From a paper:
During the late phase of HIV-1 infection, viral Gag polyproteins are targeted to the plasma membrane (PM) for assembly. Gag localization at the PM is a prerequisite for the incorporation of the envelope protein (Env) into budding particles. Gag assembly and Env incorporation are mediated by the N-terminal myristoylated matrix (MA) domain of Gag. Pioneering X-ray crystallography studies of HIV-1 unmyristoylated MA [myr(–)MA] revealed that the protein adopts a trimer arrangement.
To explain the role of MA trimerization in Env incorporation, it was suggested that the Q63R mutation in MA may stabilize the trimer structure such that MA lattices that form large hexamer holes are favored over those that feature small hexamer holes. However, it is not clear how this substitution can stabilize the trimer form. To be able to assess the structural changes in the MA trimer, we determined the high-resolution structure of myr(–)MA Q63R protein by X-ray crystallography. The structure of the myr(–)MA Q63R trimer in both crystal forms is virtually identical to that of the WT myr(–)MA protein with slight orientation differences of monomers in the trimeric assembly. The structures in the two crystal forms revealed only minor conformational changes in the loops connecting helices I and II and helices V and VI. Intriguingly, the guanidinium group of Arg63 is 2.5 Å (averaged across 12 examples in the asymmetric unit of the two crystal forms) from the hydroxyl group of Ser67 of an adjacent MA molecule, which forms new hydrogen bonding in the trimer interface. Our findings complemented the biological data by showing that the H-bond formed between the side chains of Arg63 and Ser67 is key for the stability of the MA trimer and hence to its function in rescuing Env incorporation.
Author numbering:
A (entry chain C): 7 to 116
B (entry chain E), C (entry chain A): 7 to 110
């Protein structure tokens, strides 16, 4: 799911933009169990493309979503960035980078 | 979720047009736990706007929806009308008045 | 859900192509409780038209769906074929005939 190079990066990323706690292995195990509960293939966490497919599957549920659902989305958003060689310090940067790249793909449409 | 003025009208609203059973607090407690079960923030039941968002989230599931889902939609549909200060006698009136606004 | 003539057909269909295990009553019980769990009316399993609506509702979840979700879709696809009196030997033939029927 994460390589050794990906995991040492993962473990430095902060949960909040200026908090002390950082992402850990148990958050990946947690996200993997959450997807099973939602009848989603947890093996999709293994690639950039799988994470991209999951975030698109979950996005329509974000606005009305519980804290559990939003935490799950945020975790997979950070995971997507790690797979993608996108350096992020915190969850918010991961979320910022997904919108500005999803904004770029709109720009690429025309 | 409901103020005292809103809770006062809620308890007079009939489940069926126009049967004996009326909405109570236990219907709100139930709907809130059902939303948690479907990973929906039950805190959206506190406002008119939150209820509209849930109703739009649930709308596409209605045609194939279980009895549990249709009851849940009906309960928050009545809850939306109370928040909007729309007087309704029964669930079916709540469903129509929500439909006439969605048309506009 | 199934008549006796349909149940005689159901119990001959193999889970996997030329495998040994065959569909049984418990797979219908499972699919029905699995649908309630996802807020889908299990009463739609009783007709060809109901199964097609369920399949259409489940379709967008297939690409990211777990093995549990695909297993549910596959069981209802076979049930559709039995209702529609389409002869299938196994789950894959059911899936192929539903795809080729939507192509026409």
């Amino acid at each position: 799911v994460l390589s050794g190079g990906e995991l040492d990066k993962w473990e430095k990323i902060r949960l909040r933009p200026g908090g002390k706690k950082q992402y850990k292995l148990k958050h990946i195990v947690w996200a993997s169990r959450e997807l099973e509960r939602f009848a989603v293939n947890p093996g999709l966490l293994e690639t950039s493309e799988g994470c991209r497919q999951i975030l698109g599957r979950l996005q329509p549920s974000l606005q009305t979503g519980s804290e559990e659902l939003r935490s799950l989305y945020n975790t997979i958003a950070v995971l997507y960035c790690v797979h993608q060689r996108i350096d992020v310090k915190d969850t918010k940067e991961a979320l910022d980078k997904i919108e500005e790249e999803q904004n770029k793909s709109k720009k690429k449409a025309q």
